[PDB]
Symmetry: C4
Subunit: 33 residues, 4 copies
């Protein structure tokens, strides 16, 4: 359960990095536009 809570925390963090990156790419694409 705690191990499960832990995996989910990390999964949440990983998606968050993915999201940041996606918005960062958008931002860049628009800034050079």
């Amino acid at each position: 359960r705690m191990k499960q809570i832990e995996d989910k925390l990390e999964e949440i963090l990983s998606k968050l990095y993915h999201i940041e990156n996606e918005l960062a790419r958008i931002k860049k694409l628009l800034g050079e536009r």
Copy 2:
């Protein structure tokens, strides 16, 4: 109270997947 936390975690993850869908639509709108 661990399960209730794990439960919230699940919900939060689902929001993130919904966000990723919004981003996919957006990126297509922007021609990327």
Copy 3:
């Protein structure tokens, strides 16, 4: 601590709704563009 964990969960959820909404507005603005 558990009450603190709880407030943070909810705060996280609230920002997530805000974010969804912001992306939803963007999407709409671009779709009508």
Copy 4:
């Protein structure tokens, strides 16, 4: 292990605030 969870929660919140900053920049780029 509660604090370690609370700790992760803090980190996650900070990412969300960074995201909100990226969104502010984006919305200005789009003239909104």
